[PDB]
Design a binder for these strands. Structure first.
Ligand code: MG
Ligand code: MG
Ligand code: MG
Ligand code: MG
Ligand code: MG
Ligand code: MG
Ligand code: MG
Ligand code: MG
Ligand code: MG
Ligand code: MG
Ligand code: MG
Ligand code: MG
Ligand code: MG
Ligand code: MG
Ligand code: MG
Ligand code: MG
Ligand code: MG
Ligand code: MG
Ligand code: MG
Ligand code: MG
Lengths: 56, 201, 175, 139, 190
RNA sequence: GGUUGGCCUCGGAUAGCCGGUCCCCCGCCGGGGUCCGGUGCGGAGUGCCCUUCGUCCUGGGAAACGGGGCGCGGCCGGAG
RNA sequence: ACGUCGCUUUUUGAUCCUUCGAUGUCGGCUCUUCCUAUCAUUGUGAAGCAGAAUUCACCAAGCGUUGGAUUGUUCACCCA
RNA sequence: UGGGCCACUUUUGGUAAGCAGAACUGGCGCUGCGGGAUGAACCGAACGCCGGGUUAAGGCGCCCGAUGCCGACGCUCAUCAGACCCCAGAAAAGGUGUUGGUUGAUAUAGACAGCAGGACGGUGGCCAUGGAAGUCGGAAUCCGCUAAGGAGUGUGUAACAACUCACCUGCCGAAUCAACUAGCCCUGAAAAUGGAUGGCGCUGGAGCGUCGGGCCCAUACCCGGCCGUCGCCGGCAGUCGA
RNA sequence: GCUGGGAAGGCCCGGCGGGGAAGGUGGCUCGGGGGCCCCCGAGUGUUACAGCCCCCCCGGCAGCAGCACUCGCCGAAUCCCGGGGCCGAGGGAGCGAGACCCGUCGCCGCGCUCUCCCCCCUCGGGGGGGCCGGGCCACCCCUCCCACGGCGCGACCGCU
């Protein structure tokens, strides 16, 4: 079997709105520059960024 | 459409015919439903009679003459069902309700007209053959309707005249086919044009 | 897990290499899932119960759809499964007729929902086999094992009920 | 009362779906709702098909259930289902619907004229027959 | 589960002929003609042979409840054949502790008068169903004979008499008086 | 103020229907029973009918036992 | 019986949501309507229902459910 | 401002409470809008004035925009059916209603059910008593003849007797029986003005479970116009046709 | 484009075969039928007067996620054309002549001429081929290094 390299690039889209968001999820979304619904951004993938993606 | 839509209520489910009719009269169409005693309601007769008796129990405690009016004729029962699907408390709903005319049996204006049928409301296709159903005519008669017998006799007399008219129609159709065989040499020129274009296989 | 028409997937995974075990064993599962993302997720769900494996501590070395080998041949599928009812857990054996293994499993998911109100997260497919006709146990499946099968279509219900919506002729049922 | 039956070899007409308008042969029966079906001479490869979209015809082919497409094709061609079907009133009603739908404006005009003349001659002969039938005098 | 086919066949004797009008069975024998329609049941009735006159009832794609109607129709038709060949004869015994029950057969065996049931002055008048004739047998002291071609009508007439002679406000285990169906047989005894 | 050709009618069945036709019965027409057709309804509402540029020479067919009178008079049917 | 599951809001509690620029606070009398968890009457089923009487249960609220001594009483109790 | 209140979850007192008291986050208060028929808090989403497109949550029989799909597979008949977070009514226990599943057992060496025969001797076995003979009870629980028949499954008698079952056998000829389990339905299930899946109504579904494709529209998202605020402490003194 | 370098499948009576059966063809037997001749049901089984599945000593042809609509994910491995709807905000872009009928202007993508020959329609206008040299790849020879994967052969190290 050939296992390809784990992808190093992600595209993240915010799908929920800005109402009733917990403080930690709100902070990580601000750090991902997703302050609006249906906003998108490219995220370089590593351990630090992935564990932020799991929060949000 | 622009003309009057006459429907035969026999073999039609009460609420499925009423939903179709209510939409039609809201679209500005004049609808006439005849033979409302032939309308069927799904479910056995006893549980449908219980439903109407519960309707009979709803009355104004203070003054029943003000309270809900329980109309016993099958035509008025169907009319009230359509009214439950119309916005009858607005001017638009009242105009739509005025475009609907309902009859028990088939009165003389419409007994000499062709009657439509709504397949999406017929009992034969909408209801499993093993289920039970009630007749609106029998249900109405047992909650107060007084004219089941006279409408039955008038419907039988109407069906006798309709049988006579149909026999003349068959006789004219048989004579039509005989004529079509007689004038054949001078008709095949126009018959082949029809056959070429898909009319008259 | 939601549904659609299910597909079969061969998912092969292993633990990540460690100093203790340079070459850990490879494990293979048959997963019936709407898509490969769900298939990989369900694979970790099962190997976590069976082995002491994890998505973080392992990797999936292969995930490919398994095509039906004989999609033009009718066959009988026996399916062994376990599902959670409202008051317990039960093992069930069910039989279906289909042309594809994935199609028969889809039939099973609809049938468990219809008869037992079981959702797809409750159901746990553990074996699917193509059985011979003489090994079938369900009379509903067995009544189609007739080389001279023959039946009419008795009560044909009109389905073009709104084309036309109004017509003079009442529909015919016998054909 | 029933005259047509779902059975192996029975030819069915597909009334709707991806293969509407074509003939098929029933090769096998599955689970009361579908059937392994195959039109080898009508461009329908072997596949499952619900009974709801089929309309049984009067033709029945002779081949064992789940035989290969080769033997289904041999039975189809030997029985000449394509020619026999085209000669039925069912197929001619289908063809008449098709050539009526594709009728153009000029063709509608010529049909209007031909039907106008045809109806006038026929109804004239009808009136002539009515008078002859009315000429009865016998106690 | 829906069974593909559930069928059953009855055999019609030589002296009786069966005609079908859709789901309306007409059984014509030496003793008369019986009609019964089964339009409330969706089945396929067919006459099989000109040699032995088999009637076959088919039910295609039936569930549990409507597979129970195949044997019901076959038994109803067999009762129809039995009625038009042998007829039905329900005997009734009138039993009483003290007061003899007096039975008077009115016009043509169509009206039955029960006079002295449990010694009361009220006179019960039970009308037999059409086609059913009641009589007083000469073989037993207190016995009624109900004869007819339809089993449904004959047994319903016998039940009309049985339920007419009902004790009220007493212990019916002690007060056993009344007229009861003693045996259910045929006429012509073949 | 709407509207922008008409349909002048069997009863119905739905595990069945429709049409036609010779014999029997009911005062010269209907009801039955044979027999023959049709049935994914073609004697088909997915249908049918009517179909509007108008006139003038001018032929052939259709008809010619025909067509139109807010023309007269009489009679008949229809009562829900 | 030991246990266990409920329903009801004609008891009394628990709470304090509405009302303190005020919703007149007990009982009786008068009068109407409703409920059924039916005392009687209609029709029934069961009994350790022989009859009479009684008891249990079902459909059931159509109809009726009284006159008095004592007490403000509601309740209570007795006479008939 | 220093009266707070609500929801998920954790949580204390209380039988409980739309009760009282805490922790965390969010909300309402201060907030309109789409949906939940209706509603301070639920679900979606937060808002300048507009046009077009697309959605969320939620829906698409008719009211009422949208399934007028030839939607897929089943389940379910209710003489109080059922019908969508919060949420606006139910339990234990039952059902030979029907559906699926589990385990076990019997059967061509003749199942099962029906109809039809037998159902014996020691022995009216012992101890019990007023009488208990298989059948009020305490213990025992055997043997022979057998195809089989318990020193007895029930009815019955004061005791007997007389029936009946176990068990064996004939006719019948092929599948059958039991105990569980959990889906829908039913029983359990009684309140006061006449009434509430929102209504009409719906039973080849407009119900329940699992799924597909279309479609509907919020003040949300995208494109565009216009208004204002903020920011660029932006540009212009070069009016420098030379 | 990829995949199991798709799975099935079509045609080649696929041929030398082997094996297995049953939802059992023919035949045979039994039980029911139509004028000792043709049908229906129940048994037997291995090809017969049908077919099915697996393996081949091996396949060949076509097509190829199919324009016989069985079952996918895609596009630096993707381009062309058409239709419906809403909209048109802005208003001195001239570094050149010293603007003056007028900023048809910047960035970007192209065409022709300042070269010469032809070719085809057309009475000068239109539509084409180019016009000489270089590399790079495709075809043939033989030619080096590296990467990745597989196999084999060793010598060293570590593990029995
Ligand atoms: Mg929210
Ligand atoms: Mg019997
Ligand atoms: Mg008494
Ligand atoms: Mg307060
Ligand atoms: Mg408080
Ligand atoms: Mg006041
Ligand atoms: Mg007041
Ligand atoms: Mg009660
Ligand atoms: Mg609190
Ligand atoms: Mg405040
Ligand atoms: Mg705030
Ligand atoms: Mg808000
Ligand atoms: Mg709202
Ligand atoms: Mg609500
Ligand atoms: Mg908008
Ligand atoms: Mg709505
Ligand atoms: Mg709408
Ligand atoms: Mg309930
Ligand atoms: Mg392609
Ligand atoms: Mg402008």
């Amino acid at each position: 079997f050939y296992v390809p390299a784990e992808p190093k690039l992600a595209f993240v889209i915010r799908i929920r709105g800005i109402n009733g968001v917990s403080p930690k999820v709100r902070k990580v979304l601000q750090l991902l520059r997703l302050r609006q619904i249906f906003n998108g951004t490219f995220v370089k993938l590593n351990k630090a960024s992935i564990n932020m993606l799991r929060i949000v | 459409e622009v003309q009057v839509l006459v429907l035969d209520g026999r073999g039609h489910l009460l609420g499925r015919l009423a939903a179709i009719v209510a939409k039609q009269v809201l679209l500005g169409r004049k609808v006439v439903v005849v033979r409302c005693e032939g309308i069927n309601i799904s479910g056995n007769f006893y549980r449908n009679k219980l439903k109407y008796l519960a309707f009979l129990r709803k009355r104004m405690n203070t003054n029943p003459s003000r309270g809900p009016y329980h109309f016993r004729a099958p035509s008025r029962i169907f009319w009230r069902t359509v009214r439950g699907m119309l916005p009858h408390k607005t001017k638009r709903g009242q105009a739509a309700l005025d475009r609907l005319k309902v009859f028990d049996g088939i009165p003389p204006p419409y007994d000499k007209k062709k009657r439509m049928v709504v397949p999406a409301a017929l009992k034969v296709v909408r209801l499993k053959p093993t289920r039970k159903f009630a007749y609106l005519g029998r249900l109405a008669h047992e909650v107060g309707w007084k004219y089941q017998a006279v409408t039955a006799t008038l419907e039988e007399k109407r069906k006798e005249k309709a049988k006579i008219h149909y026999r003349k129609k068959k006789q004219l159709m048989r004579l039509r086919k005989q004529a079509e065989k007689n004038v054949e040499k001078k008709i095949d020129k126009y018959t082949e044009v029809l056959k070429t274009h898909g009319l008259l296989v | 897990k939601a549904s659609g028409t299910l597909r079969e997937y061969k998912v092969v995974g292993r633990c990540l290499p460690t100093p203790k075990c340079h070459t850990p064993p490879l494990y293979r599962m048959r997963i019936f899932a709407p898509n490969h993302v769900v298939a990989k997720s369900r694979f970790w769900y099962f190997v976590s119960q069976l082995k002491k494996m994890k998505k973080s501590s392992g990797e999936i070395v292969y995930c490919g759809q398994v095509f039906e080998k004989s999609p033009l041949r009718v066959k009988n599928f026996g399916i062994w499964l376990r599902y959670d009812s409202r008051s317990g857990t039960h093992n069930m054996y069910r039989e279906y007729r289909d042309l594809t293994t994935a199609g028969a499993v889809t039939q099973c998911y609809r049938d468990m929902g219809a008869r037992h109100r079981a959702r797809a997260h409750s159901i746990q497919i553990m074996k699917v086999e193509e059985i011979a006709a003489s090994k079938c146990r369900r009379p509903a499946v067995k009544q189609f094992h007739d080389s001279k099968i023959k039946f009419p279509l008795p009560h044909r219900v009109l389905r073009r009920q709104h084309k036309p919506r109004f017509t003079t002729k009442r529909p015919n049922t016998f054909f | 009362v029933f005259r047509r039956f779902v059975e192996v070899g029975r030819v069915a007409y597909v009334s709707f779906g991806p293969h509407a308008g074509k003939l098929v042969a029933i090769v096998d029966v599955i689970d009361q709702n579908r059937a392994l079906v195959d039109g080898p001479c009508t461009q329908v490869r072997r596949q499952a098909m619900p009974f709801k979209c089929m309309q049984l015809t009067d033709f029945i082919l002779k081949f064992p259930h789940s035989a290969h497409q080769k033997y289904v094709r041999q039975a189809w061609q030997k029985a000449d289902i394509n020619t026999k079907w085209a000669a039925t009133r069912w197929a001619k009603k289908i063809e008449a619907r098709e050539r009526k739908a594709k009728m153009t404006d000029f063709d509608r005009f010529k049909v209007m004229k031909a039907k106008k003349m045809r109806n006038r001659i026929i109804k004239n002969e009808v009136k002539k027959l009515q008078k002859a039938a009315l000429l009865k005098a016998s106690p | 589960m829906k069974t593909i086919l559930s069928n059953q066949t009855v055999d019609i004797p030589e002296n009786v002929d069966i005609t079908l009008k859709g789901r309306t069975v007409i059984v014509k024998g030496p003793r008369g003609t019986l009609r019964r329609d089964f339009n409330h049941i969706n089945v396929e009735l067919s006459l099989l042979g000109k040699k032995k006159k088999r009637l076959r009832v088919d039910k295609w794609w039936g569930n549990r409840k409507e597979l129970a109607t195949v044997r019901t129709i076959c038994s109803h038709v067999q009762n129809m054949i039995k009625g038009v060949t042998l007829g039905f004869r329900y005997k009734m015994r009138s039993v009483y502790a003290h007061f003899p029950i007096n039975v008077v057969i009115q016009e043509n065996g169509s009206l039955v008068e029960i006079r002295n049931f449990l010694g009361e002055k009220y006179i019960r008048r039970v009308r037999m169903r059409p086609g059913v004739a009641c009589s007083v047998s000469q073989a037993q002291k207190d016995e009624l004979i109900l004869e007819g071609n339809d089993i449904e009508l004959v047994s319903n007439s016998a039940a009309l008499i049985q339920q007419a002679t009902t004790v009220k406000n007493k212990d019916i285990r002690k007060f056993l008086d009344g007229i009861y169906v003693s045996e259910k047989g045929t006429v012509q005894q073949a």
